[PDB]
Design a protein around this ligand. Sequence first.
Ligand SMILES: Nc1ncnc2c1ncn2[C@@H]1O[C@H](COP(=O)(O)OP(=O)(O)O)[C@@H](O)[C@H]1O
Ligand SMILES: Nc1ncnc2c1ncn2[C@@H]1O[C@H](COP(=O)(O)OP(=O)(O)O)[C@@H](O)[C@H]1O
Lengths: 253, 633, 632, 234
Amino acid sequence: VDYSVWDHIEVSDDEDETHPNIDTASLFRWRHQARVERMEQFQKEKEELDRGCRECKRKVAECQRKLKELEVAEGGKAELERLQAEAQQLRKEERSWEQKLEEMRKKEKSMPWNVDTLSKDGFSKSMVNTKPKYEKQIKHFGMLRRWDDSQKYLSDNVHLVCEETANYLVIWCIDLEVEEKCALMEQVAHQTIVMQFILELAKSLKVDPRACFRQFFTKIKTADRQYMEGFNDELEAFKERVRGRAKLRIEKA
Amino acid sequence: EEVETFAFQAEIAQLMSLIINTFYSNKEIFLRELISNSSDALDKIRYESLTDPSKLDSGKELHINLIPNKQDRTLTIVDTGIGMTKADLINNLGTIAKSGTKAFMEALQAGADISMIGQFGVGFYSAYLVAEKVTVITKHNDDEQYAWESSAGGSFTVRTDTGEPMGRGTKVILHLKEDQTEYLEERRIKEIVKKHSQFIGYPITLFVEKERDKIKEKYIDQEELNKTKPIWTRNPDDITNEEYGEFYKSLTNDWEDHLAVKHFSVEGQLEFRALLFVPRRAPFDLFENRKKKNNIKLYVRRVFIMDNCEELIPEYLNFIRGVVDSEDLPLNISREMLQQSKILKVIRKNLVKKCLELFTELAEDKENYKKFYEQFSKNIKLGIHEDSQNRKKLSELLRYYTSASGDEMVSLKDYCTRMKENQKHIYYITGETKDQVANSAFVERLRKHGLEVIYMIEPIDEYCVQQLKEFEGKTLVSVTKEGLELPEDEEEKKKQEEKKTKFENLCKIMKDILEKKVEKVVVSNRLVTSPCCIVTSTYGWTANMERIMKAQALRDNSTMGYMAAKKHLEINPDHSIIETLRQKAEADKNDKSVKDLVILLYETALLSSGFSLEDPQTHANRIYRMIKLGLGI
Amino acid sequence: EEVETFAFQAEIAQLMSLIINTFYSNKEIFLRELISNSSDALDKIRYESLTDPSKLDSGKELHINLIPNKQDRTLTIVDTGIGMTKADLINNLGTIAKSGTKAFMEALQAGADISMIGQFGVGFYSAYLVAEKVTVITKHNDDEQYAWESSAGGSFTVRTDTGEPMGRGTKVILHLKEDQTEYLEERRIKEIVKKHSQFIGYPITLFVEKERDIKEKYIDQEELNKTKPIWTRNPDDITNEEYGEFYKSLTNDWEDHLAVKHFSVEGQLEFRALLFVPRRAPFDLFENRKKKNNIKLYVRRVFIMDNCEELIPEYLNFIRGVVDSEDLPLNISREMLQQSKILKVIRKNLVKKCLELFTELAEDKENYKKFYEQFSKNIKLGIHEDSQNRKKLSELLRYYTSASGDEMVSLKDYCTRMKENQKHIYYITGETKDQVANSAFVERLRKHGLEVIYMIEPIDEYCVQQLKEFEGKTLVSVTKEGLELPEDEEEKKKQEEKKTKFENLCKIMKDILEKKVEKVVVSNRLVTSPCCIVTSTYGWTANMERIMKAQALRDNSTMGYMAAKKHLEINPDHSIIETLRQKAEADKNDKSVKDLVILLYETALLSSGFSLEDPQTHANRIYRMIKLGLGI
Amino acid sequence: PEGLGHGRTLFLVMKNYPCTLRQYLCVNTPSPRLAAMMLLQLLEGVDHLVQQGIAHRDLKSDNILVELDPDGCPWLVIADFGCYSKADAWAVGAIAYEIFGLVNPFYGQGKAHLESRSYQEAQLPALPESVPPDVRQLVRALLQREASKRPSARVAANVLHLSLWGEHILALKNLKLDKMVGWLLQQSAATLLANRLTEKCCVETKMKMLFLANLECETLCQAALLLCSWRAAL
Ligand SMILES: Nc1ncnc2c1ncn2[C@@H]1O[C@H](COP(=O)(O)OP(=O)(O)O)[C@@H](O)[C@H]1O
Ligand SMILES: Nc1ncnc2c1ncn2[C@@H]1O[C@H](COP(=O)(O)OP(=O)(O)O)[C@@H](O)[C@H]1O
């Protein structure tokens, strides 16, 4: 395991560098400018050297070639001596190019990774959306009567948002109220009139009640003392209508 | 002399205590490691199957099951991965800091598809965070069932087991301490798997035992927790909008799909793909200093690493909900934070660039852009206030009401097109409400002359406009400042000069009487139907701007008290009122009425200009004086 | 059947890498570890000196030096603590996870005074984060000068050194990887020792080489660790003089603290603490999101972690202090606590003790005036946030009231002066003292002689909206609907009579001025102004609504929707409304009256702290009346 | 009917940036003390730039934006909105002649594209007497020809810290203030004076808080000996 490569990375836009007297924006555009300048400068140094070394080894070659030509010739190896001296110190200067060519590599080593060098974009694709029921767990959230239990219990599902769950609470409160036990009907109808409470209060937000579910239930940590305020009275008051609906319903079994 | 060389050795007993206690911050991660390791085993056996389907003969399916057992306080994770041979059990599990996975990968041919999770070879021992006695029963091909057992001591025992054949795979049985019994209930489990390791490739099927025995229900019930496949790994151009949407709903429980979706990837030393969604509606608690700052969750090789680090995306882009996933990052030993943070900074740069692109792309669907903008406009202005670089590219995303555009915002460019060949500036007025600025005193001259204006009616605006100095080489000027020079004819200029010659005295003595409030008073140029108005000094705070600051709750009180704003009063020379006023003045100086009238109209103008009077009581009393007179009390 | 027992073994190679690469998050910590270890060495020999003087015979200095040599890229930390004998060198430094310090501590008698920094045993190896080769040269009594030397590979070499004797002690030499030459310069070093380990007991003396060639500073000693840890000393033995010095040293400041708390808890959690309140608020408070706390946690005198939000609830930024414990479950990197709930217990104890410093400071009226006028915002903020201390926070408040001029008074001074029938506290929220002082609403009360409170700060509403009660006497704003103040029955029947006289006037005014007000009714709180506007009981108040709309980042929908419902009251004895009822009952639907009603309604809305939607209409009406009076 | 909305949003500070110094200077003139203060601001900024290694060769009064505090002292900010080392120093020397109302010499005199470009000797217009003697000596020493004698940014900023915030006493003079780290707290005590001595502008406190911290004795002692030598008239 080794992390050495990630050690040196350099980013123009850094929050830490800012000083109260220097404007952030111009500082960033200065730093970025300096980085771009330095990287292109090192690259230009590298390319200019890449030429120099190549053309000096080329000189090594031409010296060889024409010295070989004179090597074959008669009596001209005095020119061999002189140009062999030229070529030997030329070869050392070529090894100097090599030396700084290796330094080029060392600079590349020290070249701190920046946003461009580190990564090159591969692919990209954007899309724009252009587009325009569990009754027994309703009975369970109902049985609870502590709308924390029922809150996360119906936050179990996306279906709670659908009008259909609200429509079913109507069904279940109605037919429960004539199940020969009045208690459980209001032990859920607290949820029903809380449904309508948050319905018109999220309409006082004009937001879909579905959104305001979590907004209301855990509104504040105290949550209006589990919302002790106004839930019973209003629910027995809605239980009036639920009783009418239920009683007519039981007549139809 | 003599140099003696010795090799490093380790005190196993203390070393293991170190590993158990000091490494992992949170105790619940242990479930992640066992799961991850089991996933590695699955990948090994699956790879082996491809070359030789003979290997998968022992067992077809590849699943991971968690079987909590409350009665005996044992939580067992069963996987059907390659198991461990006897030698492997002793070597891999037995030696600290050795990871079989790393070996399998290195041996494997280069470029192999399989990418396995763990490499450190120390993660497994974390199970002792919540267990005293761990028991591993494994059975692998070419070997018999064997059962490693250890109690976190220096010793581990390997015995050939003779129990029910488990087939290919590993069963790891934990025995929970008296404390940390919390892990047994399915609630905590389900939660944890949802938090970390939700997107591992294989089906995690919990086996909880519920007894009804009344139609008995849920004797044992497999609730496959890991449900949604990771999408971002799939290639684009294969993902319809609907599929992307399902992921959004799952990622963030929401009843309605996303609004727009970006999806891209970068290859390089930093390799990382990404999903970015913009929600259809803003959340209720955005900008409520809620604990959550960013919603994007970082992933590595698919295990949730870390979230909500501020560095990921700047604050103005907080709404973007997304999943970033890479294949290799310098990771802290606990696997809960990057080693060095500058990698996160490169990530941030790439993100904001792509996101801003997603936006300017959305500008096409005028309808969708209307929805998105009226929803998250604040964030864009905030960015203008903060992001230094993207400021320019941010600007175009703006949209405003203007004098011309009616009940339809327009960009800044559309206004740049409709410039009158001499505008040289953009005219904007900041206020509280559209109608009010619309009927304001300042704009009247322009609307007469036909120059267009912009209604910036939001508190957040000033924060933006104060830095949005220029745009497309055409600058911005507020109408409520001292100069307001608009293109005119020379005859108009000499006429205005004549006005000044006529009214120079009137300004003088009004300055005299109405002292200690206004620096100076001068014949106006921007008024055509109202007697007078107040503009602030060029450099000083505009009236509206001041109003905003005095209101901010956590303002520095002392500075606000020290603060004062210079006022300059302009008078409209052709108005009948000021005309008769110059008459009464040049007629007689120091008349009582002209004094009181002047105070009255200055007060009412200060009221109309948006500035608020220091004490309304004097003004109200002056009004009452007048009413009484009319009523002939 | 047969059970084969083996023993855990470790891949030393991989383990070593894990430690150097993955374990420690910030590279600069290596300086902390080497220093801490040397401190331990120092503590050992001091202890040993106690029993026998002979042990300290070699040298008595007990000091630490750090000589950076740029010339050869070697940073060497030299100490005079008990060194290590060969055996120890091989065993301690060699074997991973073996802590000689731990062994020494265990061996000591239970009541031993010494407290030694580390026990984990993996620390020394951190040096490799910045060093290719770590050469340790140590000489300890009972052995000859040796020289450990390792290159983070699988091996280490130990050899008797024959160089200059360094007496007793230990000297660790580093060779820095070229890429990390930054640590060599005096600046980075000095910065580091201050941030981590500036409170270790012994003297840290840097040796930087400078040439003034005239020539000087060839080798200058700059003792970095200078301020001594105070909190360890006994409280009550420290005068308010030194407390200040430590403060200025702790937080660079040109003046001294304002007040200082100092205490210690010895339970399951043993921790001491210093808490200071600065004289002047930091100019950037509440403006920088990054810095939330100023207290710095310490464990056994080394800086662990700071600025963790959990330590103190955010409305205590101004508090500047230091927390130090002797033992905490610490992450291996020694940069964060393993259990975070410990921080919670710490927070509770802290806030309790701080709220004490403050209610204690309430005595020095003068000092309390200074402190309160400085950091009042924070207290109200706490009232807004802290649920429990809300009650105990309240008393720290101070306000202007009708009866007190230029002298803020607590809520209690007002509870005492409550006339027998008050049953409530009367407060009015506004924007400036004078304005609320001359307001329309208060006039009745000031006539009846009651006292009222001027809440003139934007932050107030956030507080008062939750400060429902106080000492069983509630609060009521004067700008609400039902301001019911104690009265006589004759006054009541007279008011009833007023209503009988004016019932029609309210009706037709409601008619003409429709849909701007919900109801108009004969007033009870006015005595010299014709009319005023109070908001509905449940809705928002006037300036509360104003402040909210003026907030920079606010949900537009919610802000508009939760709003005031306006009710206009009329003062029945005023001459204006009297003549108005005359003109009305005389003739209905007269042009004049219509406009009059809307003119005075506008001016009242203006004087009620509300802002008219469009001033232009009002200004034009004013101009019309001006032209009329001036006969234009 | 009784729903809640008391959240607390994030607080944002607003900064007017109305003008560039050239402007603010022609419209208003500052008192000598406040002028020294803003000169200090510039020195600090230029140093910080020198540290990051980015050197804006060109600094002109049009570049420096002025942040008008509301009814409050101007806060200077360097910027490049208008398109080696020690050059910035020479530039800031010339900005100064302006702050005191003396129009820039070299904007018209010559040799401004390079401080190395030799201006005519001593033609520098003598500063008005409203400036304290030490600041005067400072700008003269700063605008001197050679970068060799030219003191670096940090030296100058320390000189100003000494003179303005620090005590003005004889120990302070004539190099009686023997450098010490303990003397750094003595410098704070020296800075205790001037906290309320001229409290007409709030910036004094601000700068005191934001810069007094990073004060380094070596540069401080160099600044001290230079400060004495002038005043000493040695
Ligand atoms: N369920 C399993 N099935 C097969 N092999 C396993 C299982 N769990 C662990 N191992 C083996 O035991 C080794 C212990 O490695 P571990 O401590 O988990 O670190 P890592 O997370 O790097 O794998 C693993 O490398 C793997 O080879
Ligand atoms: N400078 C020193 N002088 C003497 N003994 C030392 C020195 N540094 C380390 N040691 C010994 O070598 C052991 C190495 O321990 P280390 O890795 O530092 O872990 P710890 O921080 O727990 O001591 C220490 O326990 C200590 O006994």
